[PDB]
Structure formats: structure tokens, C-alpha cells
């Protein structure tokens, strides 16, 4: 579960989320991650360590072929100080069943299939962007 709890004060924002993570526990802050950013040609920013990367996937029907396997996708993310990795399959449940369901890796992989986690992505939009702390579960 990715509990919604931000560094800015908010009510009923405890357990402000409840999710699913089929491949360990860890807590840290959430950062967006453009889909095309997870590619070899992309320059690695490496801004600061101790963060969780949230990646949203679009529809694979109108979409052309990805640069790398969702596999190497999560892998590379590992290197990034982003210590955790989530993946959005709302408009792609094939990504839900994608690659070796098992985590050949260890950086906790947590897909969502969230009907309220896309609601939480609208939260990441928010009116104050984020400055939002993050809770695993």
C-alpha cells in the first residue's frame, strides 16, 4: 500500500491510500518519472538520494513499441537514488501481468491497478504539486 500522508499538514490524509504490490518494507518520498525518461539515452540527473519514483504508463494500443523492457525499466530505476519503484496499469493491465511476474530484482516493485491510485495521481497533480511525503505499506 502507498499510504497518502504529505509533509504539509492535512486531515483524513492518514491511510489516505490503500494499494497492492505483488512483486520488503521501506519508507521514503515519491517523485514522478516520465515513461521516456527511462531509457539509456536519457541523461541521468541523480538530483538527491532517498526518493520513490512513480511512473505512469499510457495505453499500449495507440502507443508505438517501448525503448526497453518494463524489466530493464524498473532495473535502471534502481540505480537512481529513487529507492522504491511503483508502476501505473490503469490504462494498461497488460503491464499488470508484464514480464516475469517474479521480482528477479529486490528494489520493491509495486504495481497498482489502482482505481483510487489514479485518483492519487490526480493528487500528485494537486494544487500545490507535491511537497508530499510518502508512506509504503
Amino acid at each position: 500500500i502507498i499510504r497518502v500522508i504529505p509533509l504539509k499538514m492535512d486531515p483524513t490524509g492518514k491511510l489516505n491510500l490503500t494499494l497492492e504490490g505483488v512483486f520488503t518494507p521501506a519508507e521514503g518520498k515519491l517523485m514522478q518519472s516520465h515513461p521516456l525518461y527511462l531509457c539509456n539515452a536519457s541523461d541521468d540527473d541523480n538530483l538527491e538520494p532517498g526518493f520513490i519514483s512513480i511512473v505512469k504508463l499510457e495505453s499500449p494500443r495507440r502507443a508505438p513499441r517501448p525503448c526497453l523492457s518494463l524489466a530493464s525499466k524498473a532495473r535502471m530505476a534502481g540505480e537512481r537514488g529513487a529507492s522504491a519503484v511503483l508502476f501505473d496499469i490503469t490504462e494498461d493491465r497488460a503491464a499488470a501481468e508484464q514480464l516475469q511476474q517474479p521480482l528477479g530484482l529486490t528494489w520493491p516493485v509495486v504495481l497498482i491497478w489502482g482505481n483510487d491510485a489514479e485518483k492519487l495521481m490526480e493528487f500528485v497533480y494537486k494544487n500545490q504539486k507535491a511537497h508530499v511525503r510518502i508512506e509504503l505499506k
Partner: protein, 102 residues
């Protein structure tokens, strides 16, 4: 509809594929990161053609404003001289009113 200058637009993560004659730049804010087609890369970046999709890339040489490629510069800061694509405090072995030096 579709964002201007983009042909595969999305309202969640931004444009996906721009026009075949235009570039896409990954402009990241403090929280989010949105790609934004644009006619030319900003001065700190340089153009990089590719048959599949174009993209702007940062340079790896310091004290350079605009650079031809990752291993070549064409304009440093208002200051130290330039020699064969390298910006140096003094003109090395070049014996050099332009800030050009060669």
C-alpha cells in the same frame, strides 16, 4: 484534443510523440516531469537527430554556453578564451581582439 506541436498528447504525462520535424525536451518541475515539444533546444542543450525520435541532450563540457556536440563547443561565457572546442583561462600554446584563440 491534441496539444499544439504534438501529435500524441496525454493529459497525465504530457506529449508522447511530437511532429517528425520537431524535437521533444523533458522539462521536469520540482515534483513532476513533462515533455514539451519545442522548435529548438534551449541554449544549454544541443540538437541530436535520430530516425526514430529526436531529443535534446545536455553537454559534458564546462564553461560552455552553446556546444556543437558532446565533444565540441562554440561559445563560452563572457570571459576565458576558446581553443578547438575547449574553454581555457589562457590560450594554450596558441600565442593568442576576438576571444577566439588559434
Amino acid at each position: 484534443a491534441c496539444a499544439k506541436g504534438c501529435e500524441l498528447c496525454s493529459e497525465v504525462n504530457g506529449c508522447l510523440k511530437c511532429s517528425p520535424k520537431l524535437f521533444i525536451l523533458l522539462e521536469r518541475n520540482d515534483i513532476r516531469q513533462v515533455g514539451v515539444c519545442l522548435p529548438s533546444c534551449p541554449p544549454g542543450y544541443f540538437d541530436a537527430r535520430n530516425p526514430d525520435m529526436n531529443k535534446c541532450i545536455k553537454c559534458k563540457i564546462e564553461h560552455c554556453e552553446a556546444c556543437f556536440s558532446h565533444n565540441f563547443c562554440t561559445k563560452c561565457k563572457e570571459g576565458l578564451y576558446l581553443h578547438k572546442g575547449r574553454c581555457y583561462p589562457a590560450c594554450p600554446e596558441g600565442s593568442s581582439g576576438t576571444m577566439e584563440c588559434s
